[PDB]
Write a protein that binds this ligand. Structure first.
Ligand SMILES: [Fe+3]
Ligand SMILES: [Fe+3]
Lengths: 192, 192
């Protein structure tokens, strides 16, 4: 019932920022496994027939949450990138909210990089919006996603080692610095 | 105060099970960073003058515990391996305790592999002994180590992706299966 999300670009199209090798493993093996696992774990449970978002919003810690969170996180992650983005910062309401909540986009980038690099272990740095329009940076452990806390996820950096280890090894910060160049802000803006 | 532990073998000596590349990054970069961080974080705190082990036993969750736990974990990890072990299973008191508590060494291996593969995200599978001589398998998240719970750690498998990603990518189970052939049971026995 859960299917792989189609990439809007070729597996090597994010080069030189993310290698084809990383996309091949990260999308083709890790995300495939999360989808496979979710399909294996939901039969016989009331989570069968639920969207990944509904599961992430409701399930306690466990294998189903872990895999549904990872399916949601990776879907949002791969689909927020483009080979050659038209713009390299957000405009519109998101641009305005970033100014309001972080002072400037440049300062948001600093804070978001810091959260990404500071997360100990596996997880995700997320920029989300709450139901009243305020932005939040969160460190989501392991497979967690801000939907659990009732936030709407906008931009997610995967800092599981598999996201970067083939390209950057231990140098997480060097990886995170490069991601800005491939963010499709048109997609991110429309998550508000 | 905190120094890198001397490796008892050359960086390529665990080949073909663990590559030189993995030792170069895992020991030379990851463990170096954890030791560096502990040296940066501990001066001027209640932890100054304490051994790594004492810190792991006493510190609450936070950056000091994360780094001290990882120093302890990795120290025990590297020192429990040898290029060409004389035997491939424990004898003596350890051998007897494994039979007692797990039925056989083969069943211990099955349970330990299962704990290793089942740990979601970053962490460690640990075999430890309690005050009564009973053995336990624990899944320690992130930088945790059984010393916190007053258990004495005997054998630890690192299932952070950096431990295996360069050699096995996503195939953690295939990595864990190979570790058994480089365990130095002479060292592990003397931990009991
Ligand atoms: Fe990932
Ligand atoms: Fe490690």
């Amino acid at each position: 019932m859960y299917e792989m999300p189609k990439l809007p670009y070729a597996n090597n199209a994010l080069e030189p920022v993310i290698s084809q090798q990383t996309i091949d493993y990260h999308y083709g093996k890790h995300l495939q496994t999360y989808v496979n696992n979710l399909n294996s774990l939901v039969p016989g449970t009331e989570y069968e027939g639920k969207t990944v978002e509904a599961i992430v919003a409701s399930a306690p810690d466990g294998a189903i949450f872990n895999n549904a969170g990872q399916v949601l996180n990776h879907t949002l992650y791969f689909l927020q990138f483009a080979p050659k983005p038209a713009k390299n910062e957000p405009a519109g309401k998101l641009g305005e909210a970033i100014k309001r909540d972080f002072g400037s986009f440049e300062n948001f980038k600093k804070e978001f990089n810091a959260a990404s690099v500071g997360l100990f272990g596996s997880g995700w740095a997320w920029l989300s919006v709450d139901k009243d329009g305020k932005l939040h940076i969160t460190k989501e452990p392991n497979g967690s996603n801000p939907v659990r806390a009732g936030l709407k996820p906008l931009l997610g950096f995967d800092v599981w080692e598999h996201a970067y280890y083939l390209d950057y090894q231990n140098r997480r910060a060097d990886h995170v610095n490069k991601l800005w160049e491939i963010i499709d802000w048109d997609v991110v803006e429309k998550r508000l």
